[PDB]
Coordinates of C-alpha atoms in Angstrom, one line a residue:
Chain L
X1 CA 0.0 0.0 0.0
X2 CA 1.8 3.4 -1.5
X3 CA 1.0 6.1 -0.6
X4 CA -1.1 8.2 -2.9
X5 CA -1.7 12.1 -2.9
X6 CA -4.8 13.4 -4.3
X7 CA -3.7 17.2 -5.9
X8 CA -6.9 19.5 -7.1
X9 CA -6.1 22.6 -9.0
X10 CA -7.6 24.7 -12.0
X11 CA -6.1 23.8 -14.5
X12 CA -2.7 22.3 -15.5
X13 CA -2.1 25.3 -18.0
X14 CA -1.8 28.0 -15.6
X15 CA 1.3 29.2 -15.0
X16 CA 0.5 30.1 -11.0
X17 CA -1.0 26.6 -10.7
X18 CA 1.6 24.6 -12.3
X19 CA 4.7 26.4 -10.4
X20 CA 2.6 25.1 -7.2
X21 CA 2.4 21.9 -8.6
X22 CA 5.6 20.9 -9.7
X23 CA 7.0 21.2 -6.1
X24 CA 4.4 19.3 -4.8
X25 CA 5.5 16.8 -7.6
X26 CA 9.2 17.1 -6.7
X27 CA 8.7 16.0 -2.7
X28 CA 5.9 13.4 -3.7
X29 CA 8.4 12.2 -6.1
X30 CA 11.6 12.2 -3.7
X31 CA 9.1 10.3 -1.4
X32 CA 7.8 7.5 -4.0
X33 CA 4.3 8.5 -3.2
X34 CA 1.2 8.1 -6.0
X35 CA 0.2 11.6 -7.5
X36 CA -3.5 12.0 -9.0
X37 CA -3.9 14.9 -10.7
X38 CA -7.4 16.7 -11.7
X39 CA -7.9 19.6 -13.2
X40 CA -11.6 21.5 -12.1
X41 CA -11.7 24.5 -14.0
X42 CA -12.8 26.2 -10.8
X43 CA -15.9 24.7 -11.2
X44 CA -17.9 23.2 -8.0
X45 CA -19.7 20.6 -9.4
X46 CA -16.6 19.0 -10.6
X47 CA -14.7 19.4 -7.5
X48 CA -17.2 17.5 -5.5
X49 CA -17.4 14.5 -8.3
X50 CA -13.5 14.6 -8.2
X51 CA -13.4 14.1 -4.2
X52 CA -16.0 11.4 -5.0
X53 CA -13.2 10.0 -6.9
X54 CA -10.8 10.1 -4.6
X55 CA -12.8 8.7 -1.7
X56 CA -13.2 5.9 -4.2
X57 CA -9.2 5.5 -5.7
X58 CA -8.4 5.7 -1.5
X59 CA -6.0 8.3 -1.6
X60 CA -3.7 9.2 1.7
X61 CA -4.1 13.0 1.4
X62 CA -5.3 16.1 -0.7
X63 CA -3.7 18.8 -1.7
X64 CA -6.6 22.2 -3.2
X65 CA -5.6 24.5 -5.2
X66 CA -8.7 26.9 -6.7
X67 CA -9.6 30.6 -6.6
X68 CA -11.6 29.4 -3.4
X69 CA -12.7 26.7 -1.2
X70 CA -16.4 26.7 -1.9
X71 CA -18.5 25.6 1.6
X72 CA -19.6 22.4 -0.5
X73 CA -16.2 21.4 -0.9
X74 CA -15.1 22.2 3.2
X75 CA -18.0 19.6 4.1
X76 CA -16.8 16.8 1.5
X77 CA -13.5 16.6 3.5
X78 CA -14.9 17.1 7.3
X79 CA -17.3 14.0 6.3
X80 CA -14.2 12.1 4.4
X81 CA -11.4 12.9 7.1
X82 CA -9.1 12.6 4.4
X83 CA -5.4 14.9 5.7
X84 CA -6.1 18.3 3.5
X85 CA -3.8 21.0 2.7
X86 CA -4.5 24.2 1.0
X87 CA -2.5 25.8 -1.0
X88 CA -2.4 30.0 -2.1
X89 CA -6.2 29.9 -0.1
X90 CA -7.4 30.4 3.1
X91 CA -10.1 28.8 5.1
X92 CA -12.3 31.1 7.0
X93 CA -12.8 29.1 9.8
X94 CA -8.6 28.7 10.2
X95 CA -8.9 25.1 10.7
X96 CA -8.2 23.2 7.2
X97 CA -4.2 23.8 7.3
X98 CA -3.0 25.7 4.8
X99 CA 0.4 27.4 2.7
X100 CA 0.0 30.9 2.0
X101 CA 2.2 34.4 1.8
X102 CA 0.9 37.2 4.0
X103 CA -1.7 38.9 1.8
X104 CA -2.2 41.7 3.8
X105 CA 1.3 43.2 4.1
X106 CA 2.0 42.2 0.3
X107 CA -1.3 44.9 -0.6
X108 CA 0.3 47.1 2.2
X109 CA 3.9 47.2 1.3
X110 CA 3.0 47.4 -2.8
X111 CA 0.4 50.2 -1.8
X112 CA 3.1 52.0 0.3
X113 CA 5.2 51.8 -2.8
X114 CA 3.0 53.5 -5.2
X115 CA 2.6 56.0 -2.4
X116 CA 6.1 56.5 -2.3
X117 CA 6.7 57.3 -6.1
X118 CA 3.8 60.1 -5.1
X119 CA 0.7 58.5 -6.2
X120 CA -2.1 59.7 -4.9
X121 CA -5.1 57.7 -6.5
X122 CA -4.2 54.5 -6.4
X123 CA -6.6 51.7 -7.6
X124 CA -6.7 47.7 -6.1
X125 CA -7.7 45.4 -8.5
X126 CA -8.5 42.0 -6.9
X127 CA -10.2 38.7 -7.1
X128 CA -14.0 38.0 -4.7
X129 CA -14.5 39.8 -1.2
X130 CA -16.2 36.9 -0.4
X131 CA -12.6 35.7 0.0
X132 CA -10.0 35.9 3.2
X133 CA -6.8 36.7 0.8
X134 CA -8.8 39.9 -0.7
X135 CA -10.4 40.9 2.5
X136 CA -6.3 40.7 4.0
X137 CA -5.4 42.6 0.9
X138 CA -8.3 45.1 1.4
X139 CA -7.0 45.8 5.0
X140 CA -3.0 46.4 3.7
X141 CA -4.2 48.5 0.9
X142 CA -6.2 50.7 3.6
X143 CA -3.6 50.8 6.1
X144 CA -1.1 52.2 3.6
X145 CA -3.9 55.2 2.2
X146 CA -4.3 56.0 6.1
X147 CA -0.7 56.1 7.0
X148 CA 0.1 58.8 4.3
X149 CA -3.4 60.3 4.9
X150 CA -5.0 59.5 1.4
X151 CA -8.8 58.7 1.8
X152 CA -9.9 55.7 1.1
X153 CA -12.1 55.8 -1.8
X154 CA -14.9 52.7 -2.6
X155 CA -14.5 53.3 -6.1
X156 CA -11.2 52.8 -6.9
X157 CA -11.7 49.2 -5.5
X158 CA -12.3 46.8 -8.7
X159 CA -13.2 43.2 -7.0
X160 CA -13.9 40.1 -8.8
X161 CA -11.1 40.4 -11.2
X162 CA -9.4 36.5 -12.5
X163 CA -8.5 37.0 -16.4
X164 CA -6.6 39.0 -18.7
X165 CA -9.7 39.9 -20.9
X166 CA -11.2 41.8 -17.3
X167 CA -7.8 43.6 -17.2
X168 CA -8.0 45.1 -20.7
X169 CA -11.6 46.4 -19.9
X170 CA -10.7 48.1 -16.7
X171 CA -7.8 50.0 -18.3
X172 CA -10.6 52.9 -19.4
X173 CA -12.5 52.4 -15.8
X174 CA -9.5 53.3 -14.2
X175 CA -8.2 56.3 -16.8
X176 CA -12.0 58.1 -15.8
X177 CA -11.4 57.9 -12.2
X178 CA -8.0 59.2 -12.8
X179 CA -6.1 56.4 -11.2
X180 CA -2.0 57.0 -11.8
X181 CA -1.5 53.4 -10.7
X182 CA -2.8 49.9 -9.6
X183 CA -1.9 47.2 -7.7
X184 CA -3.5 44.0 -9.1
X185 CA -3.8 41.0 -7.6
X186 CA -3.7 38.6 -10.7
X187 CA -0.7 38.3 -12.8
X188 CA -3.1 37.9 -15.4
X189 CA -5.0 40.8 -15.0
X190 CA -1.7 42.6 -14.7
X191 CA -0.7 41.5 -18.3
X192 CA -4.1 42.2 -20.1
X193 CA -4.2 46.2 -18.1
X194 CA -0.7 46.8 -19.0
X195 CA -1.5 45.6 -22.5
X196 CA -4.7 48.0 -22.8
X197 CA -3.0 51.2 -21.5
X198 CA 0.2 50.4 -23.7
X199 CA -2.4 50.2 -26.9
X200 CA -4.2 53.9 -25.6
X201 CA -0.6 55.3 -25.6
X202 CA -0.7 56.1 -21.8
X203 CA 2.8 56.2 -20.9
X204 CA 4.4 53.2 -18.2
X205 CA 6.0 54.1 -15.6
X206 CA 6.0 57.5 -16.4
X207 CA 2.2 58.2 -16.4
X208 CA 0.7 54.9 -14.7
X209 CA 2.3 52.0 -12.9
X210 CA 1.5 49.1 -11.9
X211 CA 2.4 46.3 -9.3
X212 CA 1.3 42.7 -9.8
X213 CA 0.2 39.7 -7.2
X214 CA 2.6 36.5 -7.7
X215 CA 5.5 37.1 -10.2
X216 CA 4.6 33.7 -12.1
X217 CA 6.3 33.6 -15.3
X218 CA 4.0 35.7 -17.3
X219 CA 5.2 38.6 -15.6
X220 CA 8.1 38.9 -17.8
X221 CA 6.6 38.0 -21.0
X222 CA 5.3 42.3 -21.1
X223 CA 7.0 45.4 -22.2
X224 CA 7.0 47.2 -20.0
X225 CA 8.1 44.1 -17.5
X226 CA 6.1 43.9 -14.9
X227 CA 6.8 44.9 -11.3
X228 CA 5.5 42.8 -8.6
X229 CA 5.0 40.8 -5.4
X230 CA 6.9 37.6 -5.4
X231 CA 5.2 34.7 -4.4
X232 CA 7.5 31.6 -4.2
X233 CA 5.7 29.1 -6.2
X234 CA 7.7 26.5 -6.0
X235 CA 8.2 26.7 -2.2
X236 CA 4.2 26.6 -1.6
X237 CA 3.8 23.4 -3.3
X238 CA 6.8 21.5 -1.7
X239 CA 6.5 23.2 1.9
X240 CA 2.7 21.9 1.3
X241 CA 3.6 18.2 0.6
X242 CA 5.8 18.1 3.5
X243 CA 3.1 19.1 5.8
X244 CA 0.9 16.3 4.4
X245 CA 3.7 14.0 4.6
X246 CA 3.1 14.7 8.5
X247 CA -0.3 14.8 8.3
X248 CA -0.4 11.5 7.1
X249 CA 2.3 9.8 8.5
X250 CA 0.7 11.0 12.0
X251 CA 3.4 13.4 13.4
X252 CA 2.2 16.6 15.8
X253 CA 1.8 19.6 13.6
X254 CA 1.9 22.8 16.4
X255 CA 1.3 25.6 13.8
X256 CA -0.9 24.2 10.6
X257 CA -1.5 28.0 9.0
X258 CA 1.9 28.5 7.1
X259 CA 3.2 31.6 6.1
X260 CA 6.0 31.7 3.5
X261 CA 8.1 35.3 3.0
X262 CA 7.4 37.3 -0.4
X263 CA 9.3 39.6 -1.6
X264 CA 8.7 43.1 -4.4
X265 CA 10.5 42.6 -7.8
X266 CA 11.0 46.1 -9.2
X267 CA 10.8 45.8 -13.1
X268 CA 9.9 48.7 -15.9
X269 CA 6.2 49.1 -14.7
X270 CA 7.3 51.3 -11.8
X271 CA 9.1 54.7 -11.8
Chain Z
X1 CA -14.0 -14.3 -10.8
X2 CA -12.8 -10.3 -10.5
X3 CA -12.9 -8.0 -13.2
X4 CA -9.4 -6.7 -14.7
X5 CA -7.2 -4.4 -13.5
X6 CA -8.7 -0.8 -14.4
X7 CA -6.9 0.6 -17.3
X8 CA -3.8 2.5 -17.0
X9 CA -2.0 5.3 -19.1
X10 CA 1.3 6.2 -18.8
X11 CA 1.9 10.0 -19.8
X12 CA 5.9 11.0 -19.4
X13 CA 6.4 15.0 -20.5
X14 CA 9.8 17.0 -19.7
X15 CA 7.5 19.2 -17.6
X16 CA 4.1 20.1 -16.4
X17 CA 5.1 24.2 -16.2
X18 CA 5.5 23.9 -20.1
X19 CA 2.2 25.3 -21.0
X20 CA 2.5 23.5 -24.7
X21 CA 3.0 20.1 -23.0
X22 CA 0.1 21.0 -20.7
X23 CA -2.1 22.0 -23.1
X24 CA -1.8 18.7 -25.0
X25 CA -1.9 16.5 -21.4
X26 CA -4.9 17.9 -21.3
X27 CA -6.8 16.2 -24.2
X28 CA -5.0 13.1 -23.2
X29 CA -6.7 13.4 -19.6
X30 CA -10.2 14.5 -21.1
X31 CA -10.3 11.2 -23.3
X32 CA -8.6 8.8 -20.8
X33 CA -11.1 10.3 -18.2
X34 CA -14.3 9.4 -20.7
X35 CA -13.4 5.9 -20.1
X36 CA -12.6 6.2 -16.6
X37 CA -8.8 4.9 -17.2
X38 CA -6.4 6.0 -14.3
X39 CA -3.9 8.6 -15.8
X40 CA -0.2 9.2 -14.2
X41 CA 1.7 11.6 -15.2
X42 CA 5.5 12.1 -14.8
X43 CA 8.1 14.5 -15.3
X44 CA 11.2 14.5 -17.2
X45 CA 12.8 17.4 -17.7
X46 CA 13.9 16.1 -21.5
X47 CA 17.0 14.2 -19.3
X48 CA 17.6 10.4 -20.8
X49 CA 18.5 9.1 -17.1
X50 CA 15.2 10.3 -16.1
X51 CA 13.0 8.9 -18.6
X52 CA 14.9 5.7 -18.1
X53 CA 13.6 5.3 -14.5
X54 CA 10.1 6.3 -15.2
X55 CA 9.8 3.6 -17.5
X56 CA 10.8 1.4 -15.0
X57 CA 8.4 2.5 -12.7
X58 CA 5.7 2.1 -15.7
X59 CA 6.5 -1.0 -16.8
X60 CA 6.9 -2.4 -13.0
X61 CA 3.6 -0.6 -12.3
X62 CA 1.9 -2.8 -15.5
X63 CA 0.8 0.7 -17.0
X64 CA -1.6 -1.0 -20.2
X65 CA -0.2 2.0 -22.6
X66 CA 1.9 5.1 -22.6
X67 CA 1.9 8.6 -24.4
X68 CA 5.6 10.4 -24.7
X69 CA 6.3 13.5 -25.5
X70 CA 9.8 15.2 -25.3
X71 CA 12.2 16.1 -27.3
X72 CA 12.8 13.1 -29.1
X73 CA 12.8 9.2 -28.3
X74 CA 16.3 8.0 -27.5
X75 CA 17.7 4.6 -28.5
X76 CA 17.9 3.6 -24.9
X77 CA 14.4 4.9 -24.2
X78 CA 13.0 2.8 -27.6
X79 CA 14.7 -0.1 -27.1
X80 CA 13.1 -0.2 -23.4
X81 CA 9.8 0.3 -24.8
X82 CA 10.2 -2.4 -27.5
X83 CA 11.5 -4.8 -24.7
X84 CA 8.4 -4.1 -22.7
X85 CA 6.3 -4.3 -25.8
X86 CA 3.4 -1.7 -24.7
X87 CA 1.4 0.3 -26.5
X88 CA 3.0 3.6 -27.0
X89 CA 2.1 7.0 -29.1
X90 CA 4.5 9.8 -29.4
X91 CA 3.3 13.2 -29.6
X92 CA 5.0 16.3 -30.9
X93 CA 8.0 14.1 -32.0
X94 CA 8.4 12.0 -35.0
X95 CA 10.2 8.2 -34.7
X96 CA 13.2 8.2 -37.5
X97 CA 11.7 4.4 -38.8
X98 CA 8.6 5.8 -38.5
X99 CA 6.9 2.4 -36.6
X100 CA 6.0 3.7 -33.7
X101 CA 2.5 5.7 -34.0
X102 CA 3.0 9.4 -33.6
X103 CA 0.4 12.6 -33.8
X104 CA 2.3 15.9 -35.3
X105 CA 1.9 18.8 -37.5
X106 CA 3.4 19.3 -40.7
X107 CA 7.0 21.1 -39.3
X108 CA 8.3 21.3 -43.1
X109 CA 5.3 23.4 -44.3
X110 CA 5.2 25.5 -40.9
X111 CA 8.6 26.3 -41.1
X112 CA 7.9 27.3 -45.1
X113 CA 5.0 29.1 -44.4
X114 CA 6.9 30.7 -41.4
X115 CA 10.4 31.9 -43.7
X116 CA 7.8 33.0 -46.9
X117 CA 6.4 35.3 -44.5
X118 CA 9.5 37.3 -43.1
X119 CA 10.8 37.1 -47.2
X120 CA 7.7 38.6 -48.1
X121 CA 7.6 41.5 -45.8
X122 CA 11.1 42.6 -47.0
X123 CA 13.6 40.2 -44.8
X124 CA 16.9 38.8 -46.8
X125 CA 18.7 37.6 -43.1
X126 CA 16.6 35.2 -41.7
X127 CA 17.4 33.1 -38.2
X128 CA 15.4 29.7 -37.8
X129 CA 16.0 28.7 -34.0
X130 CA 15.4 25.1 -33.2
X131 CA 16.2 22.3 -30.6
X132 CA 18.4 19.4 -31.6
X133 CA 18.6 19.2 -35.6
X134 CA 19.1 15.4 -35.5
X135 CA 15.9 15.4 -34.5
X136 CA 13.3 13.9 -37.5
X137 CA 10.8 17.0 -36.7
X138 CA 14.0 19.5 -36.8
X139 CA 15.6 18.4 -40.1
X140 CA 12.1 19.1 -41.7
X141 CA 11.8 22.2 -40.2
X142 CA 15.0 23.2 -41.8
X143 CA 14.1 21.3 -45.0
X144 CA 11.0 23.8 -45.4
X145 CA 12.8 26.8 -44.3
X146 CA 15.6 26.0 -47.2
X147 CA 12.7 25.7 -49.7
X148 CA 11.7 28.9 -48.6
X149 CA 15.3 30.7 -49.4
X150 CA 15.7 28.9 -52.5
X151 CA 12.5 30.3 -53.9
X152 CA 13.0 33.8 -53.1
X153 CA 17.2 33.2 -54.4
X154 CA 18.8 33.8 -51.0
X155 CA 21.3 31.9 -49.9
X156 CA 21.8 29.3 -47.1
X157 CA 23.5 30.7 -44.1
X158 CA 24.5 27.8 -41.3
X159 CA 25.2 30.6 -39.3
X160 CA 21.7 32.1 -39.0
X161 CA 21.0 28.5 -37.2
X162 CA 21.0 28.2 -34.2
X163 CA 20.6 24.6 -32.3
X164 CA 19.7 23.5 -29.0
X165 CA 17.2 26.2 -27.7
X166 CA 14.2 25.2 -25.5
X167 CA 13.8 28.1 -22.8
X168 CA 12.7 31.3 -22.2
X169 CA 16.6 32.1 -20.7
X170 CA 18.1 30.6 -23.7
X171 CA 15.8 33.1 -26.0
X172 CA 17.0 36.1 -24.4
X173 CA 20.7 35.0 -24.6
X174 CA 20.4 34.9 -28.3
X175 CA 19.1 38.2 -29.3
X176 CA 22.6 40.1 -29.3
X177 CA 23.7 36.7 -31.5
X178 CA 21.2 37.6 -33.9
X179 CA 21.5 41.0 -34.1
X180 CA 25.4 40.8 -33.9
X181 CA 25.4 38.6 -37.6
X182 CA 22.7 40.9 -39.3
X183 CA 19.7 39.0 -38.6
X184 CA 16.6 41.2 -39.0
X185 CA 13.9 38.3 -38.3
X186 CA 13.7 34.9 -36.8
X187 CA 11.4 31.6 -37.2
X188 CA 11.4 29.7 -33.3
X189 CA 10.2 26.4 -32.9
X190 CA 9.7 26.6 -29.3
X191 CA 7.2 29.7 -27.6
X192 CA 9.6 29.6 -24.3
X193 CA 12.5 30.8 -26.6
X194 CA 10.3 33.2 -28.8
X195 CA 8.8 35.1 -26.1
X196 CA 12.5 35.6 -24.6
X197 CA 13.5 36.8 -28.2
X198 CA 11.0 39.2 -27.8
X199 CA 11.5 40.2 -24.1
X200 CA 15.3 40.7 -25.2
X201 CA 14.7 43.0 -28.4
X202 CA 12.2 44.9 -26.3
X203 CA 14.9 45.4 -23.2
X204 CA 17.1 46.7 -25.9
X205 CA 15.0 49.0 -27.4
X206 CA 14.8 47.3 -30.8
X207 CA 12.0 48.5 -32.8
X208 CA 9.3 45.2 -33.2
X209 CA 8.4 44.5 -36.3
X210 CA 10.0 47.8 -37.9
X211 CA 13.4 46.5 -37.3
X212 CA 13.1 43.2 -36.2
X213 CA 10.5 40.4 -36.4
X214 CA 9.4 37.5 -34.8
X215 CA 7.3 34.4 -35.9
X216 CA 7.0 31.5 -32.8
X217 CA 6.4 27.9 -33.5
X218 CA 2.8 26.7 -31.3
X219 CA 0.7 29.5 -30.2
X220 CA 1.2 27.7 -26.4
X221 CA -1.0 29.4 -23.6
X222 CA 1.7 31.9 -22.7
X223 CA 2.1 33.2 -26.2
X224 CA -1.5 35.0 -24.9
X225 CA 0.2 37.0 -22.7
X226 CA 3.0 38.8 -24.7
X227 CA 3.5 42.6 -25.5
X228 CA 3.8 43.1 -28.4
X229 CA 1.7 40.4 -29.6
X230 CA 3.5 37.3 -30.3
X231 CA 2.6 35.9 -34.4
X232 CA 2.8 32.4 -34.2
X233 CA 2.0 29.2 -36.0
X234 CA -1.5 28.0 -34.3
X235 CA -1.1 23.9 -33.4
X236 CA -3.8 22.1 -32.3
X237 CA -2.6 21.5 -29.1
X238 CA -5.7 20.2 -26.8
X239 CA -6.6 18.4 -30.6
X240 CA -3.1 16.5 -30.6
X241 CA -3.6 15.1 -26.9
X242 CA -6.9 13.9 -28.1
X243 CA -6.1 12.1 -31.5
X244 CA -3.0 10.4 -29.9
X245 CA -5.4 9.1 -26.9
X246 CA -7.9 8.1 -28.8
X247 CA -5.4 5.8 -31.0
X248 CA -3.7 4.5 -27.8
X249 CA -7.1 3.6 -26.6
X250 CA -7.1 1.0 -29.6
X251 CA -4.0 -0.3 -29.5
X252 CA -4.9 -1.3 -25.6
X253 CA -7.9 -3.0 -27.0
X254 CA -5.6 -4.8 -29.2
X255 CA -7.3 -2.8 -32.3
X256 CA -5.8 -3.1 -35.2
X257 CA -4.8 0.6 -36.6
X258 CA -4.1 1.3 -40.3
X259 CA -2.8 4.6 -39.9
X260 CA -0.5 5.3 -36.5
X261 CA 1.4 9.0 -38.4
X262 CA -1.4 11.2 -37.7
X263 CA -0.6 14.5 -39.0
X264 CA -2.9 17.7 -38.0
X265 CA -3.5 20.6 -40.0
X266 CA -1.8 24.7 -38.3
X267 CA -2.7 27.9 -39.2
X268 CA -0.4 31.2 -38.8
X269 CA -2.2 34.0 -36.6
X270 CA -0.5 37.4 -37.8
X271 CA 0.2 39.4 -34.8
X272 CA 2.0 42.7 -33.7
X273 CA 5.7 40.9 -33.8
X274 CA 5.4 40.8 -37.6
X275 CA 5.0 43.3 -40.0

């Protein structure tokens, strides 16, 4: 009896998603354990047939990946007891363990340095509310306007943002509430705003910048390259597999809600 | 009395953050999946010593058939395969016998398509960038792109060729190399090295396409994200998982197959890298 790993994620063609992935490969791998990959195109009814799946194929432990943990899916495992770790998501309730960066002072320090370059309306592009990362980010991002005594303003909050076709569109959203610069959550939307303000002429750095969430490859693949928060993909995934490794092998876990460092890569989309 | 053994596919790829091998994994999965098989998927990263051992592990795990893909199948990796006699398909590289089934576009009339478009839009120095040229896929590549030259009366150059190149690091590397012989244009096989091409000649400030144009090899999920916009040839990449699983899935039922070199038609999509 292997052990086998059950690993839930988007899709395999994301770049975020497959960076995460790989290291969870890498320690499976250097363990001999089984990997099961499915791919659930963020959608919930497939998520709760692939857990059905899993229960049935007997897998040791789970590792989710998704733009969130829908409450259908946190009752699937409770009622399973399957060892679960999340990966770039956070539970609510702060019990299903978890690998993460700290959101909030990523929004903070990227705010601060938008601030610092003397921005003055700033915009925050980000995925769901409904979510802890972007309620984190929402705090960081108000923390900074307060600090330098900007008001906050509602509208130059833009939630619910996941692909580079919402990022284009936003780009003349942004211009009429004379926003100078964004910090955007999605590498993605990153891309497709920076495209859009490129093809309207708007000059970058010197006119708008802009700060992106992860630094996945595709971050680099825009000129202007883009500046942003670096998540360590890599690092998630295999710091995520080792803390199932314990989870399933039994061993006392004292602090289940990791936090990995991030750091700001400065690139040519900031002055 | 129990029934068999559920079926099981073997998928080896250098590696899942290649968003052209992903693309293709997934048609493989969606067709395996239909039939409820049980997929595993292993990584590479195109190293022979590496895809030596998970053949081992696939053959020792019974796996009932196997899809490859990679750069190309090595003598030690095909002679395995024909000692362990399981189905196998290759997909996106071609077998020199050509015994082994394989699903594939047409390289040699990409690669011409690719050159006639950089002649016709004024270019007279014109780099192809490829992997390994002994490679079956690579010497057509190059057999179109000579066509191309010969047509329009401009000579062959060996030294706007340029071998072994499969990342986005390697791309960038090459753009002074290019522009230090002349070069004004480049055909890539691989998107990774294209869209570091691009990044390069855009770090430089190198006017794209007035002064320099690109044209990339697959139209890969990344190439989405470029600026400028990346012109590529368009393969069917989700549509060459597919085909190749849905042959395997024939060969595992002991089907016989009279066609197993499956070749897929491309399109070019003119973007903001060419003129």
């Amino acid at each position: 009896r292997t052990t086998t790993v059950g690993v839930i994620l988007p899709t395999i063609t994301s770049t975020y998603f497959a960076a995460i992935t790989r290291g969870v490969d890498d320690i499976a791998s250097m363990y001999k354990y089984n990997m099961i990959l499915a791919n659930s195109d963020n959608d919930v009814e497939k998520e709760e047939k692939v857990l059905e799946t899993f229960l049935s194929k007997q897998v040791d432990g789970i590792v989710y990946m998704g733009s969130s943990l829908d409450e259908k899916i946190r009752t699937s495992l409770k009622n399973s007891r399957t060892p679960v770790v999340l990966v770039g998501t956070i539970d609510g309730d702060k019990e299903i363990p978890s690998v993460n960066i700290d959101y909030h002072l990523a929004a903070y320090q990227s705010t601060k340095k938008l601030i610092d370059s003397g921005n003055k309306k700033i915009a925050y592009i980000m995925g769901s509310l409904k979510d802890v990362e972007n309620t984190e980010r929402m705090v960081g991002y108000q923390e900074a306007l307060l600090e330098a005594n900007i008001e906050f303003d509602e509208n130059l909050v833009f939630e619910g943002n996941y692909s580079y076709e919402q990022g284009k569109a936003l780009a003349e959203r942004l211009l009429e509430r004379g926003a100078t610069s964004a910090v955007v959550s999605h590498d993605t939307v990153a891309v497709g705003l920076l495209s859009a303000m490129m093809d309207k002429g708007v000059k970058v750095p010197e006119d708008f910048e802009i700060i992106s969430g992860a630094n996945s490859p595709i971050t680099q693949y825009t000129y202007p390259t883009l500046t942003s928060v670096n998540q360590p993909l890599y690092d998630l995934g295999a710091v995520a597999m080792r803390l199932l490794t314990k989870l399933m092998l039994k061993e006392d876990v004292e602090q289940n809600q990791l936090v990995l460092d991030h750091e700001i890569f400065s690139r040519r989309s900031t002055k």
